[PDB]
Design a protein around this ligand. Structure first.
Ligand code: HEM
Ligand code: HEM
Ligand code: HEM
Ligand code: HEM
Ligand code: HEM
Ligand code: HEM
Ligand code: HEM
Ligand code: HEM
Ligand code: HEM
Ligand code: HEM
Ligand SMILES: [Ca+2]
Ligand SMILES: [Ca+2]
Ligand SMILES: [Y+2]
Ligand SMILES: [Y+2]
Ligand SMILES: [Y+2]
Ligand SMILES: [Y+2]
Ligand SMILES: [Y+2]
Ligand SMILES: [Y+2]
Ligand SMILES: [Y+2]
Lengths: 471, 471
């Protein structure tokens, strides 16, 4: 048994676990050190054209430490500027993978209620970032999935559930609670008091399997779209960080090496080993992360990883350039009077092209976790985009525009103008939200004892649109 | 020292080495067991369109055992039907990687003379297949490169020469005498008796490095073409089995694992280890070839290799389909009156597309030796082909043919009709050569003591155009 066998009062606040587990708590907090904001729309402005009409065209940054997850959810322009609990663009589901308060609220309101309403609904309740309670039972400290959609997805794909899995499988599945592709399923229900309500429920599209092509077939069968493209009017699918799904295609996943083997390696003390809880870049500490299994030099292994990154970059830039041109050429054909019927096959190719290429790139470690699948997916996506473009030349010709040259989108600014994103406006609106309602959320949470101000130290120094200078 | 320190009389006949090295001789001869003819034009008829105007559009099969190398050189339709030493389509250089008689003849006539004249010039001299003398010194039995163009290539690429290399490097370089990409450099010279002569000299295009892109730059700088495409009139480059060059890109090559580690593994006897000389498929004997370094099951490792093959097939079929369509669409634009100036950029894209895709596929183990580079090359080649095709739509439109559909080439027969290859004719001509001059070559060689009839057992049972039923 543990020293807390009856459970932990205030379990959602990770600081409550420190009295039992100071070493894990200390390493866990050090994800504070990974504070860099890499603006992916600035680095890869093609992505802005790809996501025209969708919030990712406003703000999309690379992942940083878990310490920043909740605050980054609040800061992103994607969550907009609510004025109260009933406003703002996005739903409650946007908290789900950000906070140990999520399982707390599900365990209290129920899953459907939690998934009902606006993101802003829970601003003064969901206030702790990725914590011990997201991954551990507060009585036994055993690894646990705390979200019901993971087992749902596992079963649908023919996998064992979390409870049915081996320990080594659990050492990846805990991460898969969050590090997976998902969509929101509109779900009608009726509450305790008989009121009809609509939830938007996190759902893993895994019932045909976890390959990119199986998920594409799933989404096509249910005629699903995440949005209608703001330029080409294609019914689009958004990939989100399919980290676990791609990791399963790759040699390490095939061999049985878990997420935790590289990202939470064991550290040394006799009978008292412990797991490094500073989840970050395994290349920072290769002796702990790789050199237990590898006999090459660290430098040769790092050079190999760099090569993989460069291969992915090469194919990523080609795919998204053709995807971007295809969207723009479709928009031009629409301007000239091309019909939906004339554009249907083209739009199908664009949807598929971008689904495949986004699934390849949306997991930021996939270029390493599953290099060969990433390259094959980028190649396949590019081919779909080029099939669209070949068909588009003939549509453009039909309407007298065979010599049309799609505009360039080589800077974020130029791309956002094509996507009709008024950043200035969104940022100004966001700042006013942060200055008012967000501060009310934090004050109320602290007053109620849901939030410890210690957790906020340096948490809000940077976003893609400000930098006070260090997190 | 060896038991043959003064050298071996008749060294080019491998059977002369048997008295010293019965175990190596016995295993070496067992490449007889790899007798399958896989007709690659039947399997991948797109290749026929790709090679229209070039001998590979007639006959191209997968590699089989070394035991068949010389006979396969004679059988292939590519070497045609000489009637004497001054006829036939191909040059003397075509023997170079087929026979221990090659170093013998170079050591006697000189390199330039050897490289001067027709393939048929040496039909009654070059009569032994890949032998001990291709890889070993006949005094010391040490590993030796016997062909001068390898060191030339190594130096040009900044590599150490064979003599300067480590033992483990030599255990790949011996193979690289043959298992490399090459071209024939037209070389004017004057002989002993002052006669002007023209050699066609095997040359490795490595002076900018050994990557596919570096070789493409090399060939472009010297304005080289292997042939003018029979359909698109593009100045084409042919890739030939760049096995070693690609192997160097791959993780095993990067780690230092040699060709011989997998293909000529050590076998067990105490102080008397020996190397398995039956060069073939390492997957036939995984315990000898892989399981010394790998802890996964054999079956899991084989399943992984199958996955790599399937990825390569997927991308290969896409690339060559678009390459084939691009050649055919160019031919149609030419028929309509398109000018060379109008087609110049297109033809450049086709040349590059096919160079990259052929370099990816022409090494039949590359999908395993360097999987990620193979996928990246197929992706890059496909992109070049699709750039050509997009430009072609506009040329076709200019000439009133925007709705043109390039013909299908899904069978060898259909593809060869598009390529204007009269197989029947070539085969009939070939059989008459085999029935007459080839038999004269063999009879003369046996009479002169250059050829042992024992070496011919079952060697000529199969080609792509006959099968007496077993080799
Ligand atoms: C042991 C399992 C896990 C692994 C190996 C893992 C891995 C990672 C890595 C490497 C990063 C980026 C860190 C950096 O850039 O330095 C990250 C960020 C992130 N992870 Fe995890 N993670 C795990 C569990 C989870 C869980 C359970 C959740 C959800 C409750 C989650 C949600 C996130 C979020 C939202 C971010 C982005 C943080 C931000 O940018 O502010 N992860 N994770
Ligand atoms: C649409 C509602 C959501 C919003 C607004 C949101 C917001 C964010 C933000 C701002 C980031 C940091 C990187 C970035 O700037 O994009 C992030 C990263 C991340 N989120 Fe979410 N999130 C949402 C839904 C989800 C869900 C439902 C999950 C779990 C199933 C999840 C898991 C993660 C993970 C694992 C990362 C780090 C990996 C990466 O960004 O590639 N997110 N999210
Ligand atoms: C400060 C908060 C946390 C505390 C106090 C805590 C505590 C512990 C303890 C006591 C162990 C077993 C001993 C060890 O291997 O170190 C452990 C291991 C582990 N924890 Fe945590 N943990 C925390 C946060 C997290 C989070 C957020 C995750 C998921 C993203 C996580 C995932 C894991 C994993 C995968 C192991 C390895 C388990 C095994 O191999 O048996 N931990 N942690
Ligand atoms: C971040 C740390 C690591 C790095 C940089 C790394 C690097 C690599 C690379 C480059 C490969 C070749 C596969 C490919 O094409 O991608 C590989 C394969 C492999 N790695 Fe790792 N690795 C790491 C961690 C580990 C760990 C912790 C283990 C053991 C638990 C491991 C065991 C293996 C195994 C079993 C293979 C398959 C090839 C074989 O059987 O040797 N690796 N790794
Ligand atoms: C599903 C299990 C895993 C998850 C959820 C996961 C999570 C992640 C994430 C989110 C990233 C991107 C971080 C960023 O760009 O900010 C990443 C990168 C990476 N991961 Fe994992 N990982 C998993 C398995 C593994 C394994 C098994 C290994 C080692 C064999 C590994 C080694 C790495 C490496 C070397 C990087 C790239 C670091 C760099 O190049 O900067 N990961 N991982
Ligand atoms: C130890 C170094 C070498 C390795 C690892 C190697 C590997 C191979 C392999 C695996 C095959 C196909 C075997 C099969 O399908 O069963 C092959 C065929 C071939 N090899 Fe090598 N080889 C080596 C040395 C050489 C040398 C030195 C030459 C030139 C003198 C050469 C020329 C050829 C030729 C012409 C074929 C095709 C035979 C035919 O299809 O009739 N190889 N080699
Ligand atoms: C143009 C003159 C040549 C001809 C007619 C010729 C003929 C052949 C034939 C018939 C094969 C069996 C596979 C097939 O059907 O294509 C073969 C395979 C092979 N040849 Fe040649 N060859 C020539 C030049 C060379 C040269 C100069 C080298 C060495 C630098 C070489 C090395 C090899 C190797 C290593 C193979 C087995 C690998 C593979 O086919 O992918 N060949 N050759
Ligand atoms: C029947 C003809 C041959 C004979 C009698 C012969 C003889 C030998 C001998 C005595 C050794 C050293 C002992 C051993 O490792 O087994 C050896 C090794 C070797 N031979 Fe051969 N060999 C023949 C054909 C070839 C050919 C055609 C090649 C090249 C394609 C070749 C390449 C090698 C290699 C790479 C080694 C390993 C050398 C080392 O690791 O030190 N052999 N052979
Ligand atoms: C035909 C036999 C073999 C097979 C099927 C095989 C399979 C593999 C595979 C699938 C990988 C992952 C790299 C990739 O993405 O392609 C790999 C990597 C690797 N293999 Fe092999 N291999 C074989 C022979 C060998 C041998 C003989 C050695 C040792 C002399 C070796 C040592 C390695 C090493 C060092 C790596 C890099 C990853 C690591 O450091 O573990 N392999 N092999
Ligand atoms: C430059 C050095 C090497 C050469 C010249 C070479 C030669 C070849 C050739 C010509 C093939 C195609 C045979 C055919 O399709 O008929 C092949 C396939 C293959 N080679 Fe190599 N090889 C080399 C290095 C290696 C190494 C280091 C390994 C092991 C790590 C290896 C393992 C294999 C495997 C597994 C196949 C595929 C067999 C199959 O899927 O049927 N090779 N090799
Ligand atoms: Ca999605
Ligand atoms: Ca060539
Ligand atoms: Y407490
Ligand atoms: Y990061
Ligand atoms: Y070290
Ligand atoms: Y790989
Ligand atoms: Y003798
Ligand atoms: Y073969
Ligand atoms: Y075994």
């Amino acid at each position: 048994k543990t020293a807390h066998s009856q459970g932990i009062e205030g379990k959602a606040m990770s600081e409550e676990w420190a009295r039992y587990y100071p070493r894990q708590f200390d390493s866990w907090k050090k994800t504070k050190e990974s504070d860099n904001i890499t603006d992916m729309l600035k680095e890869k402005p093609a992505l802005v054209v790809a996501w025209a009409g969708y919030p990712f065209s406003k703000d999309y940054n690379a992942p940083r430490g878990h310490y920043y997850a909740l605050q980054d959810n609040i800061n992103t322009l994607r969550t907009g500027a609510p004025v109260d609990g009933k406003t703002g663009p996005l739903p409650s589901a946007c908290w789900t993978c950000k906070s140990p308060d999520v399982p707390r609220i599900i365990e209290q309101d129920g899953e459907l209620e939690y998934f009902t309403g606006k993101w802003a609904k829970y601003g003064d309740e969901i206030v702790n970032t990725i914590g011990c309670y997201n991954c551990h039972d507060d009585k036994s400290a055993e690894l646990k999935s705390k979200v019901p959609y993971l087992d749902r997805g596992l079963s649908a794909a023919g996998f064992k559930t979390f409870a049915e899995s081996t320990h080594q499988e659990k050492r990846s599945l805990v991460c898969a609670q969050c590090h997976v592709e998902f969509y929101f399923k509109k779900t009608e229900w009726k509450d305790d008091k008989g009121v009809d309500k609509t939830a938007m429920v996190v759902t893993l599209p895994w019932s045909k399997g976890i390959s990119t092509e199986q998920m594409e077939a799933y989404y096509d069968e249910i005629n699903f779209a995440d949005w209608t493209h703001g330029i080409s009017k294609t019914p689009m699918l958004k990939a989100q960080h399919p980290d676990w799904e791609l990791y399963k295609t790759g040699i390490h996943g095939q061999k049985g090496v878990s997420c935790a083997d590289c990202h939470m390696p064991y550290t040394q003390e006799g009978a008292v080993k412990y797991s490094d809880h500073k989840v970050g870049n395994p290349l920072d500490n290769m002796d702990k992360s790789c050199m237990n299994c590898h006999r090459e030099s660290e430098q040769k292994l790092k050079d190999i990883v760099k090569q993989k990154f460069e291969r992915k970059e090469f194919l990523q830039d080609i795919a998204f350039d053709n995807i971007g041109k295809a969207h723009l050429e479709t928009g031009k054909a629409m301007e000239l009077g091309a019909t939906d019927a004339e554009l249907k096959e083209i739009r199908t190719h664009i949807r598929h092209a971008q689904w495949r290429a986004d699934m390849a790139i949306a997991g930021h470690g996939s270029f390493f976790h599953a290099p060969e699948e990433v390259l094959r997916l980028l190649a396949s996506g590019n081919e779909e985009a080029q099939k669209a473009r070949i068909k588009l030349v003939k549509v453009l010709a039909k309407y007298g525009a065979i010599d049309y040259v799609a505009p360039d989108f080589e800077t974020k600014e130029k791309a956002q103008k094509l996507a009709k994103v008024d950043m200035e406006a969104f940022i100004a609106e966001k700042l006013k939200f942060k200055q008012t309602l967000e501060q009310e959320w934090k004050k109320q949470a602290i007053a109620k004892g849901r939030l410890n101000p210690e957790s906020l130290k340096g948490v809000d120094e940077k976003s893609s649109y400000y930098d006070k200078t260090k997190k």
